[model samples]
Target: EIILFSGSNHADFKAWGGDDWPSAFEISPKYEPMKLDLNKNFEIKVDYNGADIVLIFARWDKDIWAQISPYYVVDGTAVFTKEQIAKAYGSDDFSGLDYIAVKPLPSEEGVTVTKVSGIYTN
Candidate 1:
């Protein structure tokens, strides 16, 4: 099941290293949290040009969420140079879930899921 907890507001979602959904009650959500090798799904053609931060998330009952950097080099020691191929939307872990979306940034797109899926592949 996919959700719409995108936007910068979620950037503060309590990282529950020991729990899911942080807390069942919304009155108080512990701020922290922080998906791949997933199942069938679609793509969202995310531009990711306006937001400084890109948020990747999935499911409400599962523990799969991540905040990806917009620009940076992952030193692939295996090789001499680095690589930007370590992309999400352009990755397997992505577009391979029940559903997915692009959360740009509140200053840019706000809390929303630009593109999403339902029963994604069936």
Candidate 2:
């Protein structure tokens, strides 16, 4: 089962402002992260960037793991804007960026995604 956590960030994505983003993310791995499986049982946790620049790894689920970070990256990599998300998902409204709660089921052909918590709040 996949777990998710999310928050609003400063949008500007700058450092030292404490207001850039609700937070970035942090990760600790065992036996090299390239060997980690996002759809399996792993003890990975994600957090906000606070006032620092975030460094996303190519192996992590990017926002899929954070649940809400989907607002940034789709599946652990690939930085995209709201316009891109709307274009990619084919959804006109970008409101889904706020929240959701569910388990990682193969919603996309090759990507792993889920929603949780009735999925909302500002």
Candidate 3:
């Protein structure tokens, strides 16, 4: 299971926007916001097997709206734009920045876990 939390400087109630927001509210399919500013912090929680996992972060291009991910990097840092993320992932976009964490199950022996977190400073 994975959990996410997000906090933005702007406020858009009808469209589902707030400050110090949680993952449930931020990543909702129904929630939609017009524009998200920069220097926003998004928190994510990942639960899986006992082993820890590495996470990968990526972003989409705002102009062309392209999904981009960091390659050959331990921290998983990538570059992208807002338009790309919104188009690819729909309304709940993060300027093309996303977090992904994977964990190994207890029963699954000889397996690896991964966790990813992304912070966008546009």
Candidate 4:
């Protein structure tokens, strides 16, 4: 599994249990993440520049995490209805969610997220 840990001014993304040329890289500080309220008609709007990115929602159970969903970035918008969240967690309440990670995907490029907003459409 890949483990991400924060360091002084950056984070380290380490890829273990596999043979690769580059196993790790120092990433910029990923901070000021947006808070999510999934109890209603939730919509996550992300404004980013550069390469493509993906949004991943997960429930952090101490050191372990249960992935809720992965919304691939097409236009920097991820919409989830109340019913959808209900189906994801078997209830409308998503109190188990600890953080939302925005990942950049591009072998030769990097993405800089400018803003992240959560909107209750209802």
My TM-score estimates for the predictions, one after another, are: 0.28, 0.20, 0.24, 0.49
Quick one: best lDDT, which candidate? Answer: 4
Ranking by lDDT: 4, 3, 1, 2
Q: 1-122, model 4: which lDDT tens digit per residue?
A: 11232221211223335443121122222333333435556655555555444454445454433223334446654333445445654555556555555555434545555555556664
Q: lDDT of candidate 4 vs native?
A: 0.43
Cα lDDT listed for each candidate: 0.29, 0.29, 0.30, 0.43
In candidate 1, which residue pairs get closer than 3 Å at backbone N, Cα or C atoms, i.e. clash? 13-32, 14-30, 14-31, 14-32, 15-31, 15-32, 15-33
Model 1, 6-66: lDDT tens per residue?
A: 2323322223353333211121112222121234442222222232334344434445444
Question: Where does model 1 exceed 4 Å of error?
Answer: 1-48, 71-96, 108-122
Residue 68 local lDDT, model 2: 23
Model 1 alpha-carbon miss at residue 116, Å: 13
Model 2, 62-109: lDDT tens digits are 242223223343233322233333344344342223321221212122
